[PDB]
Amino acid sequence: QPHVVVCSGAGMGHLTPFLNLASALSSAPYNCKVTLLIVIPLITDAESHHISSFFSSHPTIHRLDFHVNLPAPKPNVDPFFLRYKSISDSAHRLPVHLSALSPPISAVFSDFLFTQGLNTTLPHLPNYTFTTTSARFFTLMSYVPHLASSSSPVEIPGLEPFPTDNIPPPFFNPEHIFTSFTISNAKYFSLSKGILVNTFDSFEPETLSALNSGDTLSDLPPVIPIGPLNELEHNKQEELLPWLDQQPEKSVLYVSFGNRTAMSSDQILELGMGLERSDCRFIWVVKKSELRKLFGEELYLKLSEKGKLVKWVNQTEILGHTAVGGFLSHCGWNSVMEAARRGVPILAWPQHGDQRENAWVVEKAGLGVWEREWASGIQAAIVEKVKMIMGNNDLRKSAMKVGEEAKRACDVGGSSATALMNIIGSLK
Numbered sequence: 331q332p333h334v335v336v337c338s339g340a341g342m343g344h345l346t347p348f349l350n351l352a353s354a355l356s357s358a359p360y361n362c363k364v365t366l367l368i369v370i371p372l373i374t375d376a377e378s379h380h381i382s383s384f385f386s387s388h389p390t391i392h393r394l395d396f397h398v399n400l401p402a403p404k405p406n407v408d409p410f411f412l413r414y415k416s417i418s419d420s421a422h423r424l425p426v427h428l429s430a431l432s433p434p435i436s437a438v439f440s441d442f443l444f445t446q447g448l449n450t451t452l453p454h455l456p457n458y459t460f461t462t463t464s465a466r467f468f469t470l471m472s473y474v475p476h477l478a479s480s481s482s483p484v485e486i487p488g489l490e491p492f493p494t495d496n497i498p499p500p501f502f503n504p505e506h507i508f509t510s511f512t513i514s515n516a517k518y519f520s521l522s523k524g525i526l527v528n529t530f531d532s533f534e535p536e537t538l539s540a541l542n543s544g545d546t547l548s549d550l551p552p553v554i555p556i557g558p559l560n561e562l563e564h565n566k567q568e569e570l571l572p573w574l575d576q577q578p579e580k581s582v583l584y585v586s587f588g589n590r591t592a593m594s595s596d597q598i599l600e601l602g603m604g605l606e607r608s609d610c611r612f613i614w615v616v617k618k619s620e621l622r623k624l625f626g627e628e629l630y631l632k633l634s635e636k637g638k639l640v641k642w643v644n645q646t647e648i649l650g651h652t653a654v655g656g657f658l659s660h661c662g663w664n665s666v667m668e669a670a671r672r673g674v675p676i677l678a679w680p681q682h683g684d685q686r687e688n689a690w691v692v693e694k695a696g697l698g699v700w701e702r703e704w705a706s707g708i709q710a711a712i713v714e715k716v717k718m719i720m721g722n723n724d725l726r727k728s729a730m731k732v733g734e735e736a737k738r739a740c741d742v743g744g745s746s747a748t749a750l751m752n753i754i755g756s757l758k
């Protein structure tokens with residue numbers, strides 16, 4: 331009976347958890363009427379494919395497009411940052427757009443980019459901000475308006491200090507494009523009904539206990555873990571599954587630095603050489619002619635003999651496969667949670683944004699280990715650490731326990747399932 335609107339943003343790291351939320355709410359035991367807002371046009375052609383597939387497989391979820399013009403490119407500015415700004419700038423349009431829906435909407439579950447727009451413009455709708463990052467990094471985000479100097483760590487009372495090394499450098503520049511919309515939106519988190527986080531109590535217990543006490547970041551509304559949100563299905567299974575079926579248990583390293591272009595040609599080459607020297611079986615989402623002459627023919631062949639060099643996979647199907655023994659990851663939060671759910675040990679090589687703090691959380695939780703200066707010697711970093719990640723050892727066991735706790739959290743009666751049920755049960 332309750333009609334809820336899930337308001338997604340731009341790019342897969344934002345899209346996926348919104349799709350997962352929308353799907354979870356549509357089905358039992360929540361049984362909501364769900365509308366899924368999509369910002370058009372989409373930033374890449376790939377997302378269009380995935381979004382269309384989703385609505386076909388969930389006919390009871392209504393699509394709602396929300397047009398926002400592409401901003402004009404700039405020499406200096408990142409194109410994703412420009413797009414986020416444009417979505418943030420558009421957000422004030424949402425209450426009218428959303429209130430024109432039927433039936434009556436009970437609540438909005440929205441991207442952080444829509445916070446200021448939804449929370450300051452009439453009509454006032456009940457808005458839960460759904461952050462797609464860790465509780466850890468979210469607490470830093472909430473503090474960005476209170477940033478002055480970068481001389482010392484940022485110390486939020488009641489939380490472990492944030493070293494300057496891990497804070498995105500833009501956050502110390504109030505007119506950096508990213509910082510500007512972070513501030514604008516974070517200033518109004520206090521007017522949200524709650525902050526939903528794709529995490530679980532036993533994964534981030536120190537952060538969450540501090541928040542739950544009322545003494546730390548007291549202006550925030552309740553911060554509510556609702557994860558790990560379990561994944562969607564698709565009408566095209568992962569192509570590599572029968573190849574994975576042929577490999578020994580826990581023998582394959584899954585390698586992914588996310589959707590966007592992450593590493594330089596020199597870095598890709600070095601990773602190639604390291605993977606070659608490791609003799610590990612692998613599946614590596616690289617971001618097939620480019621690669622042959624990037625690696626050279628000798629190395630490209632040797633890599634092909636042990637692994638799969640791919641442009642795209644169904645990541646959850648890979649991580650759920652018994653052949654996969656480890657995950658070399660940039661620690662985008664969706665990837666962390668997908669790995670947590672399946673108990674897959676992570677070798678964390680973070681690059682930017684929330685990734686370093688996410689990597690810290692991964693190590694603190696016993697899900698993996700963060701190689702802080704991986705990028706100073708890529709070939710050596712993989713050759714040294716992969717065997718510990720891929721071993722039958724203390725880390726494998728700690729990762730396995732995280733998986734058990736992650737499944738427990740979203741099972742009936744679990745910390746996250748209960749949290750989400752309470753939200754939905756309170757609804758109009």
Ligand SMILES: O=c1[nH]c(=O)n([C@@H]2O[C@H](COP(=O)(O)OP(=O)(O)OP(=O)(O)O)[C@@H](O)[C@H]2O)cc1Br
Nearest residue numbers: 342343346588589615642643644645662663664665
């Ligand atoms: O081949 C692939 N298949 C695939 O299903 N994914 C899926 O993209 C999703 C989003 O990724 P993150 O959060 O891990 O990293 P990012 O850097 O791309 O996003 P941010 O959180 O930093 O914005 C995850 O749900 C993956 O499962 C990604 C890749 Br790559």
